[PDB]
Amino acid sequence: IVEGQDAEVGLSPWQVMLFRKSPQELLCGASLISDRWVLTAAHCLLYPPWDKNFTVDDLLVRIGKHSRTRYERKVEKISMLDKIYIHPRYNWKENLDRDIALLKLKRPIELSDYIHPVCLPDKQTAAKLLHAGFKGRVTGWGNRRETWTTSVAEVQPSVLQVVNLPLVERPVCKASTRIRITDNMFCAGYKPGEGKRGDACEGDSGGPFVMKSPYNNRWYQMGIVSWGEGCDRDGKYGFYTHVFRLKKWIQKVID
């Protein structure tokens, strides 16, 4: 997360870290939507150009109070996966359209103060919350600064990072780039004349974009961090996978 601040303890009990088994390394973010189900981004597992295609044998998922720079053992659960379901119509080729994947844990996890699922939007919840200007929240353990060249200095969060970012109107999203955006994605972030900054960066993808409902006091995952051109560049916005659009595929998979 670029231009974010340290997350308070317990701020995001649905946060999940997708790791590489050996050598261990953070590959992306994820969210916990049930005690067996984990939501993340398809590119985090399958991106053919980079000969990328992980199996449940080369991945692990960490859940709970990690407050990074340590294996929080007691407040953190490491889990193996059972299966991965990558949306059938995922398009790695052009714009990473339908960038969604489901990870089914090997075993149901024991919830706690630090482990707890987030809600999936519903017809009306989406209806009231998804408007331009309304602010969502991104969380991750990725780089604090665009490591294009290398930017090896800093960029290593010892505590989870939060950034609340506004939803940007569709036509602005589209005119910000020469890439084709489908109704399967939305963009979010600050416009140049707004002064504030913030974006997700390398290592944050797959993670949650959530919004709190004033009608019930609940947090709903509205999007998944998918892509953007660079991190926190002026005139550019981060792109998210529209969880509600593909809410139906997530249902067919668990039924």
Added chain:
Amino acid sequence: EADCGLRPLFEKKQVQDQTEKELFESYIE
């Protein structure tokens, strides 16, 4: 599912996090 999105350390405790009001403000704006 069910009791989703209510955090054990905030919602369940009637405690609002540090950056929460910023989101609400964006709503009623």
